[PDB]
């Protein structure tokens, strides 16, 4: 029925929750997102692909070859994931008097599981309210990547897997992400002569190899860093509000809007 | 008093701009076939034909006491011009698009445009590596005077290095040396980025080193071939007459459509710097 | 070659130039441990190690 806390509290509040986001999304730093449209828009539009079109009709003057457009133009809605956490007047009064941390674990943990969700979205989406998943897609290109365990291992598979994204006419600096399991027993530091396989890999890559403990056992990805194949539309930053307080206990709730539009579904390999 | 209508060009300067950056850089990344050559700059868009010098000449230089040698390389009957064609894709963006970045959510999407720069980009080095017949134009390998030399020694943990061994030997034996610059396959190109040669490293640092001017990877070459060239001009050209950039064509039903634009045309004024299967 | 020099009484920083044949092949990168072996040749001569295709093929 009021508003708890005054500038410097709500300041440390935001702080923490952007430090361990920035610290936990590992998303973020693979895909290119369109600029925050505000919370007022809740569809976007979608991908184009299987644009089968030449175009390289190559006459003076010109023909009249078919344009690229959406292979069926129709929309999305941008979820809302949230995660809900508590604080106790009397915690707000010791900490105004007493001491003056101000204890946030609780929005500390809300933003660690919220971005765990998020990172679960993108690398998974919900079968239930139906969405794209990097390991579920359709059109996804599979590569086997076993037999490894061997000296030479990972890397007889990045090799097809960028043979593979070449051969379908969808390259550039690609980026790499593995399950933990593997981008730390992928450190086979003998290739032949000096140099990490991890570091030849990301040599290969040029856009780093990442880790995202999200993954599954034995699963891994490359994909094509550009825009205009992957995108992830925001409708707002990871940002905490308040839910109005209940029995003075005043609860607060973490929220993000994203979703990911993958455009181009070429640039993707799996197991 | 509003959209509708027949109108010249819908996008403000900004976002002209942004479409502009946007088939530039998609190009950078797409073209490989102007990267091993080098081109004859940007002539404009009037120049519809450029010279096409004859062929090779086995003249070299000398030196002596006092200049006699009168070192001749002369062109012998004709030039026989050629004409630089055109390349291009299509935009249909909507007009409820357009609109709504304008008063509302406004993150104005392009990837169409990418996608149809891409695709002309493909297109143009496949003109590159491979010719048409319709224009009766020369591809790389299908040109004239390719100096063929089998392979048939791949799938071995060693075997690819000897044929460009060979190939660098029988275009050193044409009088024609310098630094080299090897194009594969994508099947070819992986397979030769395989394990250690059993004497050292991966194979393709020792072919980098051979070559001195890279080895180069393109999807658009047939499934198991590659060339090896002599990136130097006096042998190989590309004239240019116009850099790739979208102009509107015309207003469709009530939509957009926009083409993107390059005009290229090479020129093997030596075809002895060419190595095939 | 370098002791070959140096017994002559005619040392100092040396230049070498191979065939490229060699400049290539030359890159048996084990030596033992982890230096190309044409870096390791590069660190003895002290003043480069060039090459040029117009020498023959197994020459330098």
Redesign the interface.
Same mark, same amino acid.
Not at 53 to 62: L, T
Not at 166 to 169: S, V
Not at 191 to 194: A, I, L, P, V
């Given at each position: 029925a009021e508003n708890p806390l005054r500038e410097e509290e709500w300041a440390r509040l935001n702080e923490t929750v952007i430090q361990v986001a920035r610290r936990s999304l590992v998303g973020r730093r693979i895909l290119d997102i369109?600029?925050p449209?505000g919370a007022?828009?809740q569809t976007?539009?979608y991908?184009?692909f299987q644009?089968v079109?030449?175009?390289?009709?190559?006459?003076?003057?010109?023909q009249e070859?078919?344009?690229? #457009? /959406?292979d069926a133009?129709k929309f999305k809605t941008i979820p809302i994931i949230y995660k809900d956490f508590l604080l106790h007047w009397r915690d707000i009064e010791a900490a105004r008097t007493h001491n003056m941390p101000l204890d946030v674990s609780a929005a500390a943990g809300a933003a660690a599981l919220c971005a765990q969700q998020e990172d679960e979205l993108i690398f998974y989406g919900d079968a239930r309210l139906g969405y794209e998943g990097l390991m579920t897609a359709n059109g996804r290109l599979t590569v086997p990547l076993g037999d490894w365990t061997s000296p030479?291992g990972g #890397?007889?598979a990045i090799?097809?897997a /960028?043979?593979k994204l070449?051969?379908?006419?969808h #390259?550039?600096p690609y980026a790499v992400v593995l399950s933990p399991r593997l981008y730390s027993q992928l450190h086979r530091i003998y290739?032949? /002569?000096?140099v990490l396989e991890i570091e030849t890999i990301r040599q290969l890559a040029s856009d780093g190899v990442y880790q995202s403990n999200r993954l599954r056992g034995e699963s891994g990805v490359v994909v094509s860093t550009?825009?205009?194949?992957m995108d992830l539309?925001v409708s707002m930053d990871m940002v905490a509000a308040y839910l109005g307080a209940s029995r003075m206990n005043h609860p607060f709730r973490v929220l993000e809007a994203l979703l990911l539009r993958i455009?181009?579904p070429d640039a993707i390999c799996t197991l």
């Open positions: 369109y600029g449209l007022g828009v976007v539009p991908d184009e644009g079109s030449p175009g390289a009709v190559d006459i003076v003057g010109e070859t078919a344009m690229v #457009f /959406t133009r030479g #890397f007889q090799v097809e /960028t043979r070449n051969e379908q006419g #390259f550039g290739e032949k /002569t000096g550009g825009r205009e194949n539309a455009k181009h």
